[PDB]
Amino acid sequence: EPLDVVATFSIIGDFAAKVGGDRIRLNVLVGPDSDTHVYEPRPADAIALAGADVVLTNGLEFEGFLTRLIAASGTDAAVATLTDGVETMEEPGGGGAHDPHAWQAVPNAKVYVQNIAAAFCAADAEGCAAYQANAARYIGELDALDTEIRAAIAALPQDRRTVVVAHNAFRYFEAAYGVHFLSPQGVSTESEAAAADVAGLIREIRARNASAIFAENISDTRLLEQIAREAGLPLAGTLYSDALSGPDGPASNYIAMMRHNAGAIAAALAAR
Numbered sequence: 001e002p003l004d005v006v007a008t009f010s011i012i013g014d015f016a017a018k019v020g021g022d023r024i025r026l027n028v029l030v031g032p033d034s035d036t037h038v039y040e041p042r043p044a045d046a047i048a049l050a051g052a053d054v055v056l057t058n059g060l061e062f063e064g065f066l067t068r069l070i071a072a073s074g075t076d077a078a079v080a081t082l083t084d085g086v087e088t089m090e091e092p093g094g095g096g097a098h099d100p101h102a103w104q105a106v107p108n109a110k111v112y113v114q115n116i117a118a119a120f121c122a123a124d125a126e127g128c129a130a131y132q133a134n135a136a137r138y139i140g141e142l143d144a145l146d147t148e149i150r151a152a153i154a155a156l157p158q159d160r161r162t163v164v165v166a167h168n169a170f171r172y173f174e175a176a177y178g179v180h181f182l183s184p185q186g187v188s189t190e191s192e193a194a195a196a197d198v199a200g201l202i203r204e205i206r207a208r209n210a211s212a213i214f215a216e217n218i219s220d221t222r223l224l225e226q227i228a229r230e231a232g233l234p235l236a237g238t239l240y241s242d243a244l245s246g247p248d249g250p251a252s253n254y255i256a257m258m259r260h261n262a263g264a265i266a267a268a269l270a271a272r
């Protein structure tokens, strides 16, 4: 009777719970504090897909395992790519690959949400008015959030807008909001460290007068702690990049995740 939905990872799982309410049964593959770039699907994940009516995915090559997992599971679920209709950004490096981290700009989260609603509308026409009224309610909360983030940032001094994080995961926040981010890893956490290039990072840190270093919830902290040491900059806290916190963390849903991040960034930038 309820719609069987599978979401690839936590951030889009939260969006699904918002649009779908009581009418869906939700399963999430990659969970809180876990990293989708390196996730290897387990056999339990194939069982989940096999029963789904709807599978929700970021797309943009975020989930390198999906298409395999789809064929292994034999699922007939319809698959919705929630970045459909988002203004995407190309990866810096490559490779006409796209940067998958589109949810870091709240306007794009509105789109993910619209696509969830459409997907549920296609699978359960009887529920469609309810899916859309949930989406519209939530989209109103996202619009207020967007306003608050832009406002807080645009206030801050033009000359102190840079922070250091773990991977290159906030380019859409930069584009929406005007905060510049450096990191030792690229767009994906698949690679390494090339501690052979912290001295490169550090030099860019000095040239840009970066205000602070942040850990990320998906990643181990040691290099960040060391970069902090060598740059003489505080380790200011933890940002939530590609996953929610668990419950009882400060980022257990998307809106809370963004308010945390934006508040932590602003405090650090204003510290100087």
Ligand SMILES: [Zn+2]
Pocket (backbone or CB within 6 Å): 037, 101, 167, 168, 169, 187, 188, 189, 241, 242
């Ligand atoms: Zn990432």
